[PDB]
Amino acid sequence: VSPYGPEARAELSSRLTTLRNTLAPATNDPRYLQACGGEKLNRFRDIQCRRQTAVRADLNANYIQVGNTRTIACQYPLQSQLESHFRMLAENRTPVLAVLASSSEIANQRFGMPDYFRQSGTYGSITVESKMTQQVGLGDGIMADMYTLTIREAGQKTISVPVVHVGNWPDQTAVSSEVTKALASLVDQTAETKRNMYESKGSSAVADDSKLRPVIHCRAGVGRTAQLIGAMCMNDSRNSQLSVEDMVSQMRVQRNGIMVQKDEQLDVLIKLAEGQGRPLLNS
């Protein structure tokens, strides 16, 4: 019985579905962050944010840790949320922002997805400038454009955050294991270089485990975001022997039960796990 056959995968699904169903938000569910006084918090009323790992009280965003890998996963900020977003970005001394929402989605004004990282702008007390720098082929026609976001605010020290935008990964789809491995590497290396810069400067953020965390988001922050996160988790040697079952239960327990949304996205994670001889199921 191959540990990666229909049967075993049949069990993994069984388990993860039970979990997803259990995590479904209830009305004013105490496990999930609730909108304060009118301003909308959630982009999709059914894609909620665990109160326990909430990064900010007014953002749909979570601190996530699978094994030893620390990141922040979030929704695409709404217009009213942009200043707090940049605030989170800066305090985190963000080593790397990875946006996985496509240019078409961003372009489409019915989606309310402000084009916040490709243009300069002012947002309350914070002003922002963008600067394109490189473009990298990941494979399969998938392309990553990179920008550098300089976030300034009076009385605050200026922070730069490097951005990696995969402009052509469609929603509800899964890019191949190879493009996925290639993007994870691209995100780790970008994070590494920026981290090292803070470190050579003696940033105190370097000590704090609630900071220097890569920030990743597609539109909802549970499909494309989750697939990439599971991939970063897999190419960190310290997560040796963590199974695909644990990987997914920790993401679901720290954000919402939808994390790793489509079945095909779970297949990409399973291929990489297999290529590693990483176990699918616990016990």
Swiss-Prot record:
Disulfide bonds: none annotated. Induction: At 37 degrees Celsius in the absence of calcium. The active site is at residue 218. One of its GO terms (cellular component) is extracellular region. Keywords: Hydrolase, Plasmid, Protein phosphatase, Secreted, Virulence. It catalyses: O-phospho-L-tyrosyl-[protein] + H2O = L-tyrosyl-[protein] + phosphate. GO terms for molecular function: protein tyrosine phosphatase activity. Residues 1-276 form the Tyrosine-protein phosphatase domain. It is found in: Secreted. It is an enzyme of class 3 (hydrolase). Monomer. Essential virulence determinant. This protein is a protein tyrosine phosphatase. The essential function of YopH in Yersinia pathogenesis is host-protein dephosphorylation. It contributes to the ability of the bacteria to resist phagocytosis by peritoneal macrophages. Belongs to the protein-tyrosine phosphatase family. Non-receptor class subfamily. This is Tyrosine-protein phosphatase YopH. The chain holds residues 186 to 468 of 468 of the full protein.
